[PDB]
Amino acid sequence: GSLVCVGTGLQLAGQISVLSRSYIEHADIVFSLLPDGFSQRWLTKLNPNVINLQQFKNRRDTYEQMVNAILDAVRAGKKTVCALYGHPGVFACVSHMAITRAKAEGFSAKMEPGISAEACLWADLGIDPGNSGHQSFEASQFMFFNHVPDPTTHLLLWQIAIAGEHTLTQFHTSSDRLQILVEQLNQWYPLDHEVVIYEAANLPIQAPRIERLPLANLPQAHLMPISTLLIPPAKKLEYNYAILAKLGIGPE
């Protein structure tokens, strides 16, 4: 048995690497975890032997039954291939878990890179991150932990739709959660600061969503699972005189 986790991307059918697609064709069994059903049908016509994991209660126990099911196949000695949405190693626990436990059982397990929502964002917004630089955080993690963003460079917040996802103790709406985030970002960015709600197109007949709005209107915004918030810089660059001095450049 063996495990190989591949990514389909955001677009349908067309946004998967030639190789990753080959893995699905030659897989003895495939474990799908895609959003829409158009993607689900496609996969099937790509390989008849497909086990949908959506069939599988806390997320702790859901992924435990998922991983367990994937392994069973690998333990039986079937060349297993796990097809996930976008990139199989980006905001994806099932893969890292499965690979980890397969490595722990001596089985061969790896992961092929695919196109993440971020890779799409750069193209759709004609942004080159290489020159500009960027930062990425899971919205929730950015709330529950101490993350100090650099407001001179782009800031992406993934899974902004489920930001503040936690166990129930008090009654808060999503807008209440988003309002807290807005307050927390206010430590660096003003309320009138323009942000962008990006949503990668799934279907080739659909265009990506690129809504701009002040940070203050985020709570009211209607968000989606795959929604990501882009927070462009709000502070100007400054010379790093310290390091410039060392390099040989000072007042010049």
Binding site: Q11, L12, A13, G14, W42, L203, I205, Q206
Partner: protein, 51 residues
């Protein structure tokens, strides 16, 4: 319908032909006006039934 979105997402030729003449190309595969309308309107939700 599903086959079309699949071909349209993979085939760069069909991709362009689509932008040349959306409606006509969708006929060439065989979609009703109600669908073509939902595609042209922009109601993704609409397509939750023609599927």
């Amino acid at each position: 319908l599903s086959d079309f979105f699949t071909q349209l997402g993979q085939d760069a030729q069909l991709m362009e032909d689509y932008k040349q003449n959306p409606e006509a190309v969708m006929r060439a595969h065989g979609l009703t006006d109600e669908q073509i309308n939902a595609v042209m309107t922009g109601d993704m939700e609409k397509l939750k039934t023609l599927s």
